[PDB]
Design a protein around this ligand. Structure first.
Ligand SMILES: Nc1ncnc2c1ncn2[C@@H]1O[C@H](CN(CCCNc2ccccn2)CC[C@H](N)C(=O)O)[C@@H](O)[C@H]1O
Ligand SMILES: Nc1ncnc2c1ncn2[C@@H]1O[C@H](CN(CCCNc2ccccn2)CC[C@H](N)C(=O)O)[C@@H](O)[C@H]1O
Lengths: 342, 342
């Protein structure tokens, strides 16, 4: 299938094994901003669900399907590839909703549905939106969408902005410099120091931060889920040109995302911005191994390029330059191996 | 090979991927008890290495091979299956030891060595000794050992002892009781509460603890690596009969291990006991689903059975009984999915 072809089997088994556990579901369910905002988006847009046919892509425990049922959906196909499908089935029965919610075990790229749907609902967003490549599965599912069907969420905005955080920078640097030791119990480790540095700086940093570290207004990159195709997400090129508001060392770029549920009654936003209450997505920072000095009024331009790999992730290339001085930094990150700093 | 036959490929890819990272090596290297004890065992037993041929099974960064070289080894075959092999090669060159340390990329069950060796060195120990099944690879390597060759470690002692920890016990129910909610955003979750409880009780708990929780002297199970065969580790039956030193509720069994390097000059012990300074192995606790009351002077008997599986791990079965009252408990645990509580 389209899933097995883009996904090395060892990565797929690990991914679905992880989402099979109830403890993991509990952790996600306890994000009240996430769960409450989804419920509000669906219930306040009840006319988008009332007597409709719906597809829930990667339903997990089933909660979004339950919200669709509360909003009056006639039928909800709830697709789930992990063993969480069986637990969702238990909930559908114990909540007396077997007349409305039909769990379909398997990958959305592989199952067969009996009819086309009015609306697709999902939570495909990983860290910095793209982590884990579930957006592709969400877009793949549009093969089941009727003409003029809706998607919830409808659009995603990724935000990026340059930051200064000496302290985060020194922490990661200090760890790599363990390998600058000429006599670790008599052994010279220093030949591996560059490799060690590269490995640490390749890890995106998942945690939150004060907005005062941000040195320019964010640049926004939008994915319209109604219009994008799966293959659009294999290579994502995000140009940027920042007008620097503060002078200092730029240690990297910070990322967050918002999604909008554009319903008939209203648009509901779910934001993971650092100006908003914390979610289990936190925010993500990509460090530069060599920081860039810039003054307020300078332009910091470059490109953030995400290249999908078969480990169900992306290799991230970031090249940035201070236009006024020609100072450049170029950096590679492995979105599969984040540093969970919180 | 013997490795591929006992190990599902998806488990093997995940395992060697994990040991490929320098940060993981750094973590192990920074365990001073571990690294210092290995160095001391090798250097203080220099006559076991001086002008000898050695095999380092799973050499990682190469550190033990460097210690063998410091002790005078004539030649060291350093076998490693992860991409850490390439970093080891870099260190061998930068430490000017290419004439004495030969790095061999691959699994010890699959590579070919040109000659038999005087002594095998390794660090095959996982949590509770047996986690990750590397002891089998270590024993497999005795096909390369000369008659009367030595093994470093030599022997391993697994210790088990009953513990009381009411807060650890209750923590499982507190977490599972998230599911005991009749209207989580309108949804009755309660039907999943037993499944949640079951899931948490299958996870062995990796962390340390105060020795005051221990209710009896440990029972010891010894593997003599000079004498054991690979197949001895496929099914490990550990009977126990504890003479209780304290009255109270027994919530489960705690596990730790020691290994001894029995050299010609001296025996050096590496202990992960909770009476010793903490190592990166911590200790491990397996809960009983139902606690058992016992008085000081009673006997708590039963069996701990470890059954090797193709996920490169063990299913752990524990049955226990207070002889004087006939009160019995069991559990089944999955050593592949430990709870890292530290
Ligand atoms: N192709 C596929 N076919 C069928 N099923 C798929 C496919 N792909 C993934 N699945 C399942 O979709 C579920 C994913 N969840 C993950 C939630 C968002 N992800 C995050 C969030 C934060 C950080 C990182 N990641 C969606 C939310 C759902 N409403 C729920 O309640 O979980 C998991 O159970 C997955 O197994
Ligand atoms: N069949 C095999 N063929 C060839 N190579 C194998 C095989 N199997 C495993 N390897 C390698 O052995 C290395 C593992 N050891 C670390 C083991 C510790 N494990 C723990 C520790 C704590 C908790 C849990 N687990 C490195 C020690 C080395 N002396 C050094 O100091 O770096 C890793 O590089 C593995 O890839």
């Amino acid at each position: 299938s389209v899933f097995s072809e883009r996904t090395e089997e060892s990565s797929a088994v690990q991914y679905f094994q992880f989402y099979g556990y109830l403890s993991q579901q509990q952790n996600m369910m306890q994000d009240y901003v996430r769960t409450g905002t989804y419920q509000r988006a669906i219930l306040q847009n009840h006319t988008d669900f009332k007597d409709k046919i719906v597809l829930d892509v990667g339903c997990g425990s089933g909660i979004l399907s339950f919200f669709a049922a509360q909003a009056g959906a006639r039928k909800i196909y709830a697709v789930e590839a992990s063993t969480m499908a069986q637990h969702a089935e238990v909930l559908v029965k114990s909540n007396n909703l077997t007349d409305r919610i039909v769990v379909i075990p398997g990958k959305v790229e592989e199952v067969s549905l009996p009819e086309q749907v009015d609306i697709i609902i999902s939570e495909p967003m990983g860290y910095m939106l793209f982590y884990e490549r579930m957006l592709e599965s969400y877009l793949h599912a549009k093969k089941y969408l009727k003409p003029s069907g809706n998607m919830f969420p409808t659009i995603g905005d990724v935000h990026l902005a340059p930051f200064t955080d000496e302290q985060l920078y020194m922490e990661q640097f200090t760890k790599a410099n363990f390998w600058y030791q000429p006599s670790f119990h008599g052994v010279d480790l220093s030949a591996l120091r560059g490799a060690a540095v590269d490995e640490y700086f390749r890890q995106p940093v998942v945690d939150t931060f004060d907005i005062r570290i941000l040195m320019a207004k964010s640049v926004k990159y939008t994915v319209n889920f109604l219009e994008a195709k799966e293959g659009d997400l294999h290579r994502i090129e995000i140009p940027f040109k920042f007008h620097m508001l503060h002078s200092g060392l730029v240690h990297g770029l910070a990322f967050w995302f918002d999604v909008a549920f554009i319903g008939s009654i209203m648009t509901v936003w779910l934001s993971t911005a650092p100006t908003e209450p914390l979610t289990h997505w936190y925010q993500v920072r990509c460090l530069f191994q060599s920081p860039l000095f810039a003054k307020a009024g300078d332009t910091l331009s470059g490109t953030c390029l995400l290249i999908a790999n078969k480990r169900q992730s992306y290799d991230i290339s970031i090249v940035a330059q201070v236009d006024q001085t020609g100072s450049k930094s170029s950096n590679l990150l492995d979105l599969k191996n984040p540093f969970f700093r919180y």
